[PDB]
């Protein structure tokens, strides 16, 4: 739950520097591929192996949003039962390891009584930060843009060359769900410790 986020942190440091690196390289190449593409077409999210190099205890990292006090693991795919445990990554977009010309897209449900999750995302504001902890470390984002789009539209979801973004996508307005809320971070250097 919050308990399988620790399964992550701990299991990671049992993987040695070399192995970690090899996996990271695979993710980078995957991202380079997407960078250079010409367009995947992204099935709006409303097994999956594409991100195995990143998977540790069936998760690909976790995401921390301080403003809403969440720390939620991230699972590959927008799969139906995975969105009950945490955050799903939209296949077709960059893998959430950052780097020049990336754009990862993460997504989560709102208003599940037990989970919570992205329900409180509307409370997030340009200027807040959020952080992504994956096999090779923590990376940090600062919300530069906030947008509301019809589900048909996706142009905002694609890689912007030269730039490094992560989008936290959810449905909106609350309990109406006719459009999508996009909360966009822009990479900043990590300095929290």
Author numbering: 2 to 39, 44 to 51, 60 to 206
Sentences from the paper on this structure:
Anchoring of these surface proteins to the cell wall peptidoglycan requires transpeptidase enzymes called sortases, a product of an srt (surface protein sorting) gene. The membrane-associated sortase recognizes the LPXTG motif of the substrate protein, cleaves between the Thr and Gly, and forms an acyl-enzyme intermediate. According to the current model of sortase-mediated pilus assembly, the pilus polymerization catalyzed by a pilus-specific sortase is followed by cell wall anchoring of pilus polymers by the housekeeping sortase. To understand the molecular basis of pilin sorting and pilus anchoring within a bacterial strain, we investigated the housekeeping sortase, GBSSrtA, and a pilus-specific sortase, GBSSrtC1, from the PI-1 pathogenicity island of S. agalactiae SAG 2603 V/R. Either GBSSrtC1 or GBSSrtC2 of this GBS strain is capable of polymerizing GBS80, the pilus shaft of the GBS PI-1 pili.
The two molecules of the dimer, related by a non-crystallographic 2-fold axis, in the asymmetric unit of both the type II and III crystals of the GBSSrtC1 display the typical sortase fold made of an eight-stranded beta-barrel. The barrel core is flanked by two long N-terminal helices (H1 and H2), positioned approximately at 75° to each other and away from the dimer interface, which is formed by β6 strands and β4/β5 loops. Subtle differences, such as one single-turn α-helix in the β1/β2 loop present only in chain B of both dimers, and a four-turn and two-turn H1 helix in the type III and II structures, respectively, may explain the plasticity in the sortase structural features, the presence of multimers in the asymmetric unit and the observed multiple crystal-packing arrangements. Residues 44–55 and 44–54 in type II (A and B chains, respectively) and 44–51 and 46–53 in type III (chain A and B, respectively), which cover the putative active site from one-end to the other, form the lid region in GBSSrtC1. Despite the high flexibility and temperature factors (80–100 Å2), residues 46–51 were consistently positioned in all four of the active sites. Analogous to the Asp58, Pro59 and Trp60 residues of the conserved DP(W/F/Y) motif in SPNSrtC1, Asp49, Pro50 and Tyr51 of GBSSrtC1 anchored the lid in its active site. In addition, the preceding leucine residue (Leu47) was observed inserted into a highly hydrophobic pocket in the active site present below the lid. The residues in the hydrophobic pocket included Val118 (on the β4 strand), Ile162 (at the edge of the β6 strand) and Tyr171 (on the β6/β7 loop). The three catalytic residues Cys184, His122 and Arg193 of GBSSrtC1 and the corresponding residues of SPNSrtC1 (chain A) displayed similar spatial arrangements; Cys184 and Arg193 were present on the β7 and β8 strands, respectively, whereas His122 was on a loop extending from the β4 strand.
